[PDB]
Ligand binder design. Structure first.
Ligand code: XMM
Ligand code: XMM
Ligand code: XMM
Ligand code: XMM
Ligand code: CA
Ligand code: CA
Ligand code: CA
Ligand code: CA
Ligand code: MN
Ligand code: MN
Ligand code: MN
Ligand code: MN
Lengths: 231, 231, 231, 231
């Protein structure tokens, strides 16, 4: 199967596959069962911001998720990613709904990777109706306001359940190379999660995988479109 | 056929299809017959640097080609590129040999595009043996020193004639959009041209084209791998 | 006196010192009497954006000023700036009021300069209460919302007349050097101009000058805090 | 006195004030007695490269120092720098000689800081004869090849003992702010250390301090121009 590293913004607690009993942000290394989590004061209807960073010297993957004036949650995990990930990757965003639902609207997304002794940076502050520099998978679409709807939304804006969708950047990324002195990446995205459900679900991830990654069978709902099971 | 905008570093004068009678840099808008040229004091065996820039407000495509301490040549052309190019493009480098030959060795290549009211930047200071973020066309390869050999070079380093090769960046680039306030791009590459021929040929280009661009039939030699004829 | 290059957003027509009879954007080379202007559909109470760019190869200073969904005005002028400006400069923003007034509120400001063969970039999306990386001149202050008020505003937000204020970046900028292949700069700022006056005044500039530049005597009002007279 | 955070490239072992018994790179938090060190295979006469990074989420200051094809040494230290440093800082490079000597030649220096919810980046690949964007302290000069000589070098290139010199960037840097979601910085410099001494000394640092920082009295030699004593 795919090799996966992800930062999950998990709005629904699936305690039966390892979630804490509350909304949380998590660092996922090849398993939906996060190696590290932090409690997420998830706000429906307000725009959030996530920042993710890593470098091969400090070897500490970190993420912070914030709502302006409201809250900020941070999670870190010490991991040598050059030991987990292949040399060439694609980076992306994923989102699911399940029994319960939410909009998983991406308003912006940027990413930088550096291979020091290669550089790649992209920034999207609007998404075009046919984004030729993105690989849209599952239900992911871009809409009339220029936003990226990772999961299905009806004509009036209502989120639908049992949705899975992902967007990967078109170009493979060279995230490590044996002659590199240091490899680093940074990622930021802003997101709007709306829901009429008392318990919204399921969440959004930023993720790095093998370049030929695709939505695994059975990855809906709590598996965030990333893993075929909860191992 | 393809839609082409290019800056050509033309080491061989083909006076019969419009070249001036000397090595020159040129700005090409949909024809190998440059809309503007400047005399190029082409230096065999020394590393050169080319800088190209454009923005949709000034509407002036410019290029400068230099050898440290030796020479610098500049050419500009006033053109609304949003009137020439499709909204989505790929960017690349091309090179040819013909009867006469030269190495067309790319040591580095960078590019930035901005869509203001989208950003894309890539930088290569070394090229890996299998560059998954590049579309290599024709004879283009990367070699053991980490350089990009656009045209065929033998085992010992000798350039071969009748070669054509191109390298495009993998991801389409969004170079204009009707809601943009301003669109801009910048490109830099460094290059080493070696030749045992008294009159080296044929040259190197940086070029922007339709995303599905490929080497046209009959584009070798003086056509720089860009055009199917000299119209 | 100072040596000045500026892009002026001139909200008040002073026809007696060379203004066209309407709000305009202008390119100023050592004189308030613009070398080039374009009609500016100036909008009171809406946030505007200005983009300015130049490179020493194309030698074309350009500016675009826009309100989202409303209007965009562009002005360009062909000028070799390395022939006007000293090698070391400071860059800044200026604004005035006079008999008539307006707020000259800077919401953001960024700038990049490149000296190719040096790089400097700064970006402000919020201004702190005591910006130690800015030289504030005249009436310029930063306020509680994190904005830069170039001209005097009363406690409730009312703009005052007979105000002059400027903000320069602290560090001198190396905008040309005789060994450079190409020198380039880019600048963006966003601005909010509010006024209860039927004819608001006087305007905002982005400007480059000798590093020891200061507000000239008698530069208020129509002189935009840049020039001691209307020569 | 000054508040100091530094990464030291310490070519001389002063075991009597806490150095390990070998050349080392070290992370210094308000004391020359490094909180963390790693053995440095210091190479005389070859160009080295140092990369330093930190972000306020991972809270891990890291540094890697390398010679191409030869060696690489890494040191990290977990520290909340927003708890050590004032909100406004200057960043710089320092170097000393003492009884023993070496050239402390800076060939390039770059730095980025980001204040997320401010950006500052500078890059020097050549240093001009009178760098107006640098505060040169002590013996620091720039020479005819465009390099930064932090410590005294004679007319022919011979390093002198009992030298101290520093170069700070002119503009204060805003490295933390109470409303920031995350603060980050990155720094790179390349350096050439030549010596006719069997045991070269004393070393080079990249350092962050109070904006009004100056060379303390008695900071020569093993104190690297940063501290007034070895507490
Ligand atoms: O969308 C949230 C969740 O909905 C389903 O799980 C349930 C949440 N509440 C329930 C109540 C009953 C059943 Br049966 C299920 Cl399967 C659930 C599944 O789709 C999960 O994958 C998902 O995490
Ligand atoms: O490589 C340089 C040139 O070589 C060929 O043209 C000639 C240059 N000198 C010649 C002499 C004879 C003939 Br026949 C040709 Cl076709 C040439 C052709 O391959 C040209 O496309 C190319 O520009
Ligand atoms: O603020 C707009 C203008 O106000 C003054 O000029 C006038 C605009 N309408 C007037 C009417 C009368 C007189 Br007297 C003046 Cl001086 C003006 C002067 O302060 C000008 O410098 C400025 O351009
Ligand atoms: O330059 C290297 C060192 O030279 C001096 O220390 C000595 C190194 N070998 C010695 C031998 C004798 C004496 Br006395 C001294 Cl003070 C030293 C002092 O200047 C030290 O600060 C410095 O670390
Ligand atoms: Ca879950
Ligand atoms: Ca030719
Ligand atoms: Ca006026
Ligand atoms: Ca020491
Ligand atoms: Mn979870
Ligand atoms: Mn030609
Ligand atoms: Mn005017
Ligand atoms: Mn030490």
């Amino acid at each position: 199967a795919d090799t996966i590293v992800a930062v999950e913004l998990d709005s629904y607690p699936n305690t039966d596959i390892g979630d804490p009993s509350y909304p949380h942000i998590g660092i996922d290394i090849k398993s939906i069962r996060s190696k590290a989590t932090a409690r997420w004061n998830m706000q429906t209807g307000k725009v959030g911001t996530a920042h993710i960073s890593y470098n091969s010297v400090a070897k500490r993957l970190s993420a912070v998720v914030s709502y302006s004036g409201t809250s900020s949650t941070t999670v870190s995990y010490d991991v040598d990613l050059n030991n987990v990930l292949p040399e060439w990757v694609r980076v992306g965003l994923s989102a699911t709904t399940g029994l319960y639902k939410e909009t998983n609207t991406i308003l912006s997304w940027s990413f930088t990777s550096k291979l020091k002794t290669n550089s790649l940076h992209f920034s999207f502050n609007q998404f075009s109706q046919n984004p030729k520099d993105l690989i849209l998978q599952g239900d992911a679409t871009t809409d009339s306001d220029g936003n990226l709807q990772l999961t299905r939304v009806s004509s009036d804006g209502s989120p639908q359940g049992s949705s899975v969708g992902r967007a990967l950047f078109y170009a493979p990324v060279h995230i490590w190379e044996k002659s590199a002195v240091v490899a680093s990446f940074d990622a930021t995205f802003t997101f709007l999660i709306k829901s009429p459900d008392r318990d919204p679900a399921d969440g959004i991830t930023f993720f790095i995988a093998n370049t030929d990654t695709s939505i695994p069978s059975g990855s809906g709902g709590r598996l965030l479109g990333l893993f075929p099971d909860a191992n």
